[PDB]
Amino acid sequence: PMRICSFNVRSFGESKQEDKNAMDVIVKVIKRCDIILVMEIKDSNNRICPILMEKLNRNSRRGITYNYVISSRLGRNTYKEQYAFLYKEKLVSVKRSYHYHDYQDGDADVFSREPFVVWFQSPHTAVKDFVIIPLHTTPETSVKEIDELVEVYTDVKHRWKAENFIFMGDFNAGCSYVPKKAWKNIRLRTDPRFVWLIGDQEDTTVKKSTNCAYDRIVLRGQEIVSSVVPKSNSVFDFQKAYKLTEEEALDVSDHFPVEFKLQ
Ligand SMILES: [Mg+2]
Ligand SMILES: [Mg+2]
Ligand SMILES: [Mg+2]
């Protein structure tokens, strides 16, 4: 069974490479996953190659090799981020990737960080291919941004043959950003063909004082939905798993990763 993870790593820049403790936790988290979306990559050179070197040192299983695809730098101006997908080479490959663009009226309007959509081929799963649409919203505009994910789904269906979709990332989908009353105006929730694997009662925040399901996974496509391994869909508490204190865990990230498994 293949594990797919999304992980918001707070400010993953050159500085973070120097905290060996935090970096070792991040590597361990990645090593549990066959595909992992990493968000908040911030660098104008290369942080994604150091990570691959680190992950490919034990050249183990004569081939548990990892590769990556990374988006362009996305934002309004000086403040840019990248989405990266790290994946086990021998288990999946990238068929195509593109940056969503709204050809109608306002062209850079809704997303500050346009989804970097990636079409994966997966010869060993029941579902032979799927598309991952990642999103990292700006907190105060999460209602609109999450809602607009149905327009990305439409665009991808027009462009590619694809039937199976995974929407994942940091939607900021809780607490004061997306209150209970606002779910009514989000088509990604009110259309029930979209299946939510992380529910509104989950805690994706490392801090003990907060309990919000900021990070999410949503599927569409009857094939992929019915291929989810029962009980696999969860928050991975890396703090409890590696016996870290709150301070050590906050050095890694402010967010826990979310994940599920596919048959
Ligand atoms: Mg942040
Ligand atoms: Mg945030
Ligand atoms: Mg918490």
Author numbering: 20 to 282
Please give me the paper's original passages concerning this structure.
The enzymes responsible for clearing antigenic DNA from serum have been identified as Dnase1 and Dnase1L3 (deoxyribonuclease 1 like 3 or Dnaseγ); yet, the activities assigned to these two enzymes are not synonymous. Dnase1L3 uniquely degrades antigenic forms of cell-free DNA, including DNA complexed with lipids and proteins. Dnase1 and Dnase1L3 are both Ca2+/Mg2+-dependent endonucleases with a high degree of identity in the active site; however, the catalytic mechanism of the Dnase1-family remains contested.
Full-length Dnase1L3 was refractory to crystallization, likely because of the flexible C-terminus; therefore, we expressed and purified a form of Dnase1L3 missing the last 23 residues (ΔCTD) for the structural analysis of the core domain. Dnase1L3 ΔCTD was crystallized at pH 8.5 in 250 mM MgCl2 in the P1 triclinic space group with four Dnase1L3 ΔCTD molecules in the asymmetric unit. The core Dnase1L3 enzyme was refined to a final resolution of 2.2 Å with an R-free of 23%. The crystal structure of Dnase1L3 exhibits the classic 4-layer α-β sandwich architecture similar to other members of the exo/endo phosphatase (EEP) family of enzymes. The Dnase1L3 core enzyme structure superimposes with human Dnase110 with an RMSD of 1.8 Å across all C-α atoms. In Dnase1L3, we observed three divalent cations, with two Mg2+ present within the catalytic site. Our high-resolution crystal structure of Dnase1L3 provides the first experimental support for the two-cation catalytic mechanism, wherein His-155 and His-274 act as the catalytic acid and base residues, respectively. Using the nomenclature from Guéroult, the ’II’ and ’III’ structural cations are absent in Dnase1L3. In the Dnase1L3 crystal structure, which lacks DNA, Arg-132 interacts with His-155 to decrease the pKa of His-155 favoring the deprotonated form. In addition to the previously predicted Glu-170 to Arg-206 salt bridge, our structural analysis shows that Arg-206 forms an extensive salt-bridged network with Asp-166 and Glu-167.
